[PDB]
Amino acid sequence: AQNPNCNIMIFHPTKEEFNDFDKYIAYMESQGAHRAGLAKIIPPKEWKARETYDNISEILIATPLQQVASGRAGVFTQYHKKKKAMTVGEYRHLANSKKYQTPPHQNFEDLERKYWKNRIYNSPIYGADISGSLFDENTKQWNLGHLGTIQDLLEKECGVVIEGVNTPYLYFGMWKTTFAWHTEDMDLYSINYLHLGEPKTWYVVPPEHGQRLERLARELFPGSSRGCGAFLRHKVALISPTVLKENGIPFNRITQEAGEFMVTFPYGYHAGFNHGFNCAEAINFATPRWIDYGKMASQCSCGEARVTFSMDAFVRILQPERYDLWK
Numbered sequence: 009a010q011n012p013n014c015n016i017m018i019f020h021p022t023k024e025e026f027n028d029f030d031k032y033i034a035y036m037e038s039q040g041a042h043r044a045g046l047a048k049i050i051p052p053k054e055w056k057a058r059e060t061y062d063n064i065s066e067i068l069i070a071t072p073l074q075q076v077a078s079g080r081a082g083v084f085t086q087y088h089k090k091k092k093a094m095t096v097g098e099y100r101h102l103a104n105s106k107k108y109q110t111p112p113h114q115n116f117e118d119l120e121r122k123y124w125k126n127r128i129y130n131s132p133i134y135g136a137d138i139s140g141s142l143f144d145e146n147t148k149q150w151n152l153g154h155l156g157t158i159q160d161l162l163e164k165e166c167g168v169v170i171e172g173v174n175t176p177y178l179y180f181g182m183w184k185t186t187f188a189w190h191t192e193d194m195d196l197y198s199i200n201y202l203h204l205g206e207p208k209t210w211y212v213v214p215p216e217h218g219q220r221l222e223r224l225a226r227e228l229f230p231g232s233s234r235g236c237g238a239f240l241r242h243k244v245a246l247i248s249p250t251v252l253k254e255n256g257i258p259f260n261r262i263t264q265e266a267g268e269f270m271v272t273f274p275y276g277y278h279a280g281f282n283h284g285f286n287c288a289e290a291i292n293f294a295t296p297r298w299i300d301y302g303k304m305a306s307q308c309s310c311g312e313a314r315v316t317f318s319m320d321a322f323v324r325i326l327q328p329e330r331y332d333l334w335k
């Protein structure tokens with residue numbers, strides 16, 4: 009078996025290998041990349057997402073989210089407080105202010121320590137889930153706005169035609185902005201491109217050990233657990249690497265730089281934080297290998313988590329008993 013220790017793998021495709029997205033994903037999995045739950049892809053030196061990021065300041069962040077934490081340093085929840093709209097220009101200025109900017113630090117490892125020690129005492133503001141793309145329309149390879157759709161994948165694999173569309177989202181981050189422990193909707197894949205700015209550190213649990221994370225979460229957030237059989241779908245829970253280690257949860261860490269792709273694999277729990285002002289673009293996708301995961305994916309029973317229009321059809325076809333129960 010390839011990659012038995014479930015390490016995060018890093019790939020360096022040539023411009024020739026970069027031409028067939030599906031085939032390259034299949035290649036990565038033939039080498040066992042999926043066992044980690046997450047892989048890094050460094051694009052060919054000749055490739056570019058777009059010419060420059062010069063005129064992006066007029067993008068609107070209609071609902072910036074202030075991330076307010078509760079709990080203790082290593083085990084906390086965050087809730088999202090809606091703020092008034094601001095442009096990317098204004099946001100960047102805010103990220104750079106004395107109040108919100110990245111602190112002085114000796115190296116990544118010093119910065120990671122500062123994050124987990126001090127995160128809960130601040131409330132950084134995130135521009136999340138903004139529908140759109142920064143890929144140039146003439147960028148033909150690994151253009152996240154030009155991927156084949158999950159609906160077409162399901163149709164090719166299962167022969168059923170369904171409604172729904174699948175488009176990318178932009179994320180504008182600043183120091184300490186946080187994404188909580190989660191897997192994707194319907195345990196789909198995700199692909200994430202860091203277009204510009206400061207790095208993004210990722211933590212990830214191997215899919216074959218996901219239930220171990222869930223069991224720890226049940227113990228650490230006992231109230232949330234009683235309220236919903238799948239509360240990690242609310243995307244509000246954070247658990248530090250120190251606490252994971254203390255409880256024997258297997259996991260790995262890796263830091264993504266501007267110009268790099270990350271791919272998360274079905275049922276690979278992940279979480280992380282931003283080092284400073286940046287902008288990422290991400291979208292979900294599927295392969296034939298995803299189908300069985302989609303069938304087994306756990307759903308939020310309490311109503312807290314949002315179910316997009318397109319997810320409805322996924323649940324209807326892959327999980328008709330749960331769908332009927334929903335009704």
Ligand SMILES: Cc1nc2ccccc2[nH]1
Binds near residue numbers: 115116207263264265
């Ligand atoms: C691979 C890697 N790890 C990092 C940590 C901090 C800044 C840049 C980095 N790049």
Ligand SMILES: O=C(O)CNC(=O)C(=O)O
Binds near residue numbers: 187198200
């Ligand atoms: O970048 C973020 O804030 C969160 N991204 C993801 O969870 C993802 O791409 O799967």
Ligand code: NI
Binds near residue numbers: 190191192198272278
């Ligand atoms: Ni994700």
Ligand SMILES: [Zn+2]
Binds near residue numbers: 236239242309310313
């Ligand atoms: Zn719920």
